[PDB]
């Protein structure tokens, strides 16, 4: 049989090749590059409704010192204690920063005031810092401009002998994280292609087959990136360096797998003695629906990230979904089109005997004694959960970026003279309906300041009652500057600057937020300000919300993918139990991938998994893993008729070597992503790589065939099979 779509591609193979090449030229020439669209289309890094985000907005609004949740800190360092010379350099620097209304919304200049200069100067005396409020939220294009605008001002200013200035803060780190991610795109792709080229050269032993196979992936990659770039450039979507980095590797990985499936089946047909024309249709009948089904799965699975609350995940759905739909559409049309035209010159014929005795013998054992094989593989798959009790996620973006990026250089300058908490302060603001500048309420400020200072895990609290941050009149001139700094001009609100002991990013720091809020309420209970409203802001408060949010949206991403992938597999295969088995088996194996990844990173390498790793990697593992099952199961439906058991053996031989090669290519492609500067994306890369190695070696080869052998005809319910 010759399906209609196959005939059309066969008849118009040539222009289909030109049609996609012309499209590649258009998106390459008339559309800015994806790594350049992301920079002008990046998304804010915190959900608009997070209590930390809105609290940070209120504190800025009430104190009239900005509207964004973005702040940057300028550290001044010297080889000797900072004298008057540093002050002149500092004083001029602050005035210059104030003049830039566009980017620097406010400069909380404390070091220039003797009444509070010692509050920011290092105990060593050789360093000091100033906090800047920047325009635009963290990670947005405006914030990256503001950070650069501040950074250039610091660089252009002439420093005294031996003094140096660095710019840091969450916004600076986010700006540098984006640049590092894009800067490393070329290295990831060059390594990926170079490794894949060498691997495919061993599998086929023919350079032309590899060259044409990789060229087709280039068209899929260039068209997928080109289409996503058009959307971003038009303002339709938000982007992040994770989406660009993840999209690029998925297109290369998935795009190559479709090429391996297409050639793998075509070459198998030629071994059977089929003519070039008949072999091409045999390839289409056997893999056209598998590629489409394995394509809608990755597009659908990644799209389920759009239900997550974190912008890191929410913005990751559509760009990957559109990227995979475009890559798949090319693979289904350019693939068979290139295969046919190549066949006209006899380029894609197999170079070596495609032996099958290896997998038929494996399939015979699995099918003859399926229950023991099922039990052994389930235990191996489940034993990965032994790493769950010791699994500790991390939120410190510093540790997952190069040591030399400017934000990290400035941070390292702070650690040399300050405690690690000084660059990540915590602000608590109480707002009421009364003017609190009266002395009676100041006692409550003293009470709450001590009470908040009583919470474990805090080092320092600054306020009107504690100008220096530790325990030691309305008319003194010096006090007036403090009054307008720690009290709102209206007097209805006051704020306390709190410093933890130890990095607030740590789970210990996150635990402090709840204690701080409870302590604040306890201190104010039975006081005139008992009805006040408490707002908390800063890194500890930010990641208290992210930690809670990152949990549920891992569940939503995982559960939604299972529901969606099952629906796709149910439609593709038309069999209920087969659809459940295809994805159910991969769901169990997630424990093996989680165990392998935690063991490699947290234990062997002593680097905790970033909080983004599991949600991003779980989506791909379910998607790609089910595709390999779909390829295998879709072959069962063909070979059945010769026997429910003998069909599994025959299909195992045909699809055995094909999936193994395709499995390793995808695993290595995601593993090569560890070359990125962003260690967060490298952890995702090897987390997916390790899982797909497990899926291709155990899930598809020993678990799925054993379940099919066990269930018999019920594996194909409600289809009538004998």
């Amino acid at each position: 049989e010759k399906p209609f779509i196959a005939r059309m591609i066969h008849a118009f193979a040539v222009p289909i090749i030109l049609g996609w090449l012309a499209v590649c030229v258009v998106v390459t020439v008339f559309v800015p590059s994806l790594e350049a669209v992301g920079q002008e289309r990046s998304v804010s890094l915190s959900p608009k409704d997070a209590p930390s985000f809105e609290a940070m907005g209120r504190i800025g609004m009430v104190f009239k010192e900005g509207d964004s949740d973005s702040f940057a800190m300028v550290i001044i360092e010297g080889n000797q204690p900072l004298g008057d010379a540093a002050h002149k350099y500092y004083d001029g620097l602050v005035a210059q920063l104030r003049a830039d209304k566009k980017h620097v919304q406010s400069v909380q200049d404390l070091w220039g005031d003797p009444l509070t200069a010692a509050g920011v100067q290092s105990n060593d005396g050789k360093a000091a810092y100033v906090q800047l409020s920047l325009a635009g939220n963290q990670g947005t294009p405006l914030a990256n401009e503001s950070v650069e605008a501040v950074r250039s001002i610091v660089e252009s200013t002439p420093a005294p002998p031996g003094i140096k200035a660095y710019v840091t803060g969450p916004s600076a780190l986010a700006a540098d994280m984006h640049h590092s991610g894009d800067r490393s795109m070329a290295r990831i792709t060059m390594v990926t292609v170079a490794v894949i080229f060498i691997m495919l050269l061993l599998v086929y032993r023919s350079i032309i087959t590899v060259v044409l196979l990789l060229i087709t992936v280039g068209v899929e990659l260039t068209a997928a990136r080109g289409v996503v770039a058009v959307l971003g450039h038009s303002g339709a979507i938000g982007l992040t360096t994770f989406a660009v980095s993840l999209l690029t590797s998925l297109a290369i990985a998935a795009g190559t797998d479709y090429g391996i499936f297409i050639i793998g089946r075509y070459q198998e047909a030629r071994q059977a003695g089929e003519d070039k024309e008949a072999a091409y249709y045999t390839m289409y009948r056997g893999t056209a629906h598998v590629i489409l089904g394995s394509g809608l799965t990755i597009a659908g699975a990644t799209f389920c990230l759009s239900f997550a609350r974190m912008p890191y995940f929410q913005t990751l759905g559509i760009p990957c979904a559109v990227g995979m739909l475009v890559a798949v559409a090319v693979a289904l049309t350019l693939g068979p089109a290139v295969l046919h035209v190549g066949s006209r010159f006899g380029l894609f014929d197999p170079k070596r005997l495609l032996k099958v005795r290896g997998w038929r013998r494996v399939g015979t054992v699995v099918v003859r004694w399926p229950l023991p094989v099922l039990v052994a593989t389930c235990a191996i798959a489940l034993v990965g959960l032994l790493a769950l009790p010791g699994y500790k996620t991390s939120y410190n973006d510093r540790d997952y970026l190069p040591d030399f990026i400017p934000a990290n250089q400035g941070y390292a300058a702070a650690d040399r003279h300050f405690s690690q908490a000084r660059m990540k302060p915590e602000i608590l603001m109480i707002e009421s309906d009364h003017d609190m500048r009266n002395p009676a309420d100041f006692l409550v400020l003293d009470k709450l300041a001590k009470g908040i200072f009583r919470v474990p895990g805090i080092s320092r609290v600054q306020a009107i009652t504690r100008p220096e941050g530790t325990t030691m009149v309305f008319k003194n001139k010096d006090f007036q500057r403090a009054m307008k700094s720690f009290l709102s001009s209206d007097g209805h609100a006051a704020r306390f600057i709190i410093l933890h002991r130890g990095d607030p990013q740590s789970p210990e720091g996150i635990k402090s937020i709840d204690a701080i809020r409870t302590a604040a309420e306890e201190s104010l209970k039975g006081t005139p300000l008992e009805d006040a409203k408490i707002y908390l802001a800063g890194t500890a408060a930010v990641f208290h919300d992210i930690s809670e949010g990152a949990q549920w949206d891992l569940l939503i991403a995982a559960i939604s993918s299972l529901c969606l992938i099952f629906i796709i597999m149910l439609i593709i295969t038309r069999a209920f139990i087969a659809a459940a088995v295809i994805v159910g088996t991969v769901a169990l194996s997630l424990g093996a991938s989680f165990g392998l990844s935690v063991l490699l990173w947290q234990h062997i390498l002593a680097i905790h998994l970033h909080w983004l790793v599991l949600a991003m990697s779980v989506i791909v593992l379910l998607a790609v893993g089910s595709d390999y099952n779909l390829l295998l199961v879709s072959r069962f439906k063909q070979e059945i008729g010769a026997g429910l058991k003998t069909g599994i053996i025959r299909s195992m031989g045909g699809t055995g070597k094909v999936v193994t090669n395709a499995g390793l290519v995808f695993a290595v492609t995601m593993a090569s992503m560890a070359v990125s500067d962003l260690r967060v994306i490298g952890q995702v890369g090897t987390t997916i790589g390790l899982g797909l190695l497990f899926d291709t070696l155990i899930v598809r080869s020993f678990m799925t065939p054993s379940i099919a052998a066990l269930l018999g005809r019920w594996f194909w319910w409600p289809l009538r099979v004998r």
């Binding site: 015979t364 054992v365 003859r368 026997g643 058991k645 003998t646 069909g647």
Partner: protein, 77 residues
């Protein structure tokens, strides 16, 4: 087709022997080159092709093409 021809087809396909090459008297492990696992494949393939059960104890008694033919003839009724 003929039951004997179908059995020979299955045997030849599994063991890589042509239809005319496989003989009634030939033995799988001694002449056609089978082993402890290719015989299991043979048994399962016959079971599936002819919708019949070869019990494990009975599996041992199929040592030649003929033995399979007699078994299936005595059970394909």
């Amino acid at each position: 087709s003929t039951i004997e021809e179908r059995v020979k087809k299955i045997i030849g396909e599994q063991l890589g022997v042509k239809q005319e090459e496989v003989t009634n008297n030939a033995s799988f492990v001694e002449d056609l080159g089978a082993d402890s696992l290719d015989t299991v494949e043979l048994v399962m393939a016959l079971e599936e092709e002819f919708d019949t059960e070869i019990p494990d104890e009975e599996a041992e008694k199929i040592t030649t093409v003929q033995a399979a033919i007699d078994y299936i003839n005595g059970h394909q009724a």
